[PDB]
A paper describes a structure:
To create a red GECI, we selected the red fluorescent protein (FP) mRuby (an engineered variant of eqFP611 exhibiting high thermodynamic stability and monomericity) and replaced cpEGFP with circularly permuted mRuby in the GCaMP3 scaffold. To aid our protein engineering efforts, we sought to solve the crystal structures of mRuby, [name], and R-GECO1. High-resolution crystal structures of mRuby in several states, as well as a structure of a Ca2+-loaded [name] variant, aided optimization of the red GECI scaffold to useful performance levels.
To directly observe the chromophore orientation and the structure and extent of cp-mRuby/CaM packing interactions, both of which assisted GCaMP engineering, we solved the crystal structure of the early [name] variant RCaMP1a. Although the mRuby circular permutation was based on GCaMP, large differences between [name] and GCaMP in both the orientation of, and interface between, the CaM/M13 complex and the cpFP domain can be seen. In contrast with the chromophore in the structure of mRuby crystallized at pH 8.5, the [name] structure (crystallized at pH 7.5) shows the (4-hydroxybenzylidene)-imidazol-5-one moiety of the chromophore to be a cis-isomer. The electron density map is consistent with imine hydrolysis of the [name] chromophore, resulting in a ketone on Met214, maintaining the extended π-conjugation of the red chromophore (thus 2-acyl-4-(4-hydroxybenzylidene)-imidazol-5-one), and an amide on Phe213. This imine hydrolysis results in a discontinuity in the polypeptide backbone of [name], also observed by SDS-PAGE of purified protein samples.
Author numbering:
A (entry chain A): 217 to 369, 376 to 440
B (entry chain B): 35 to 213
Amino acid sequence: SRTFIKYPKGIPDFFKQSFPEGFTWERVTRYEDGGVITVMQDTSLEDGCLVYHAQVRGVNFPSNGAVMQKKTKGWEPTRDQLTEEQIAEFKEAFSLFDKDGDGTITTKELGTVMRSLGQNPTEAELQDMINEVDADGDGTIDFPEFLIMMARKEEEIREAFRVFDKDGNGYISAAELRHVMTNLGEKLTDEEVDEMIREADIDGDGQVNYEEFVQMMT
Amino acid sequence: MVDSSRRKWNKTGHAVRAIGRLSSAINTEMMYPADGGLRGYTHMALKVDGGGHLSCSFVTTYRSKKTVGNIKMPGIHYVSHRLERLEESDNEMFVVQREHAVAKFVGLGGGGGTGGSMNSLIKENMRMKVVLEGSVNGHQFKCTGEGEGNPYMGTQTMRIKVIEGGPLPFAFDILATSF
Ligand SMILES: [Ca+2]
Ligand SMILES: [Ca+2]
Ligand SMILES: [Ca+2]
Ligand SMILES: [Ca+2]
């Protein structure tokens, strides 16, 4: 019932603007236990009154689950969001993945990032991962879906550190760090690599140890 | 301004997180223009007896029926909602629910940061009437309801009756956000 959302002045209100004609919507809902519901809706305005028509089709709900057994107790509120700063950080990240600069993360690009962060994953997995957040099912991750995935996100930092520390001596040198950032598709000067080392290097030995790495990475 | 070198570490940290497993549940609704149309991505949590949740997500494309006239399109924004059931009769054949919803600014997007244009057809109080029908796991049903609210404050109440196929052999909650 989208017409009853308080929109601040500075955000255009798609719903209120659509009158007198109104609007429609189509929706696909997936529950984590497998149930799926498709909905189509029309919102119209007739003689000063709002009029809604909805068609729903749900399937695959487990017979023993809480929905079919009527063991539900209402919805949590929906209040989490990202900040403007976070969205701008996540856009910078996204481009590491979006190396063709097109707007979409193909399974090819996800594998190359995972490869240069040292991962060894199949299509069997690169399609599982992409399906966990492919809202619309085209088969790639665009920026809004990347946002959702990010918002939803020790042993793995340890792995990252082992990958950065190519020679295994316990310290990431400038040369090691340049190699990973380059492979990630970062465009940065050698000065900029050193500036990253300097930012991380609290004990001032010219290199990044594990604990220093953890602090930058978390 | 965030320091350049720190931005790099942050984004490297994000890339490591993005490829990692182990996803939380989240409760969020993000709106993003696509076309000339408005898309929403919503993650909600349905409370279950014993205190767990069933996590659910949906993608919605909203389309205007105004075919002539410039509609100002928003960019990316979120909406906070609280939808609460106020009453029910027996076996959930009658349900009263209310919702409070507010869109949230998270940066200049799409249509500038100037709003579209106030629509004199949407007054401070508006009524609604609804018909919803369909099936779940093959069980057919039809509900009707009525309600009202304050569109500029984001508040509304709906009284809904299950007029065919009742009592539903499934939880009414799964229909809550569909009217
Ligand atoms: Ca791409
Ligand atoms: Ca997609
Ligand atoms: Ca080393
Ligand atoms: Ca050091």
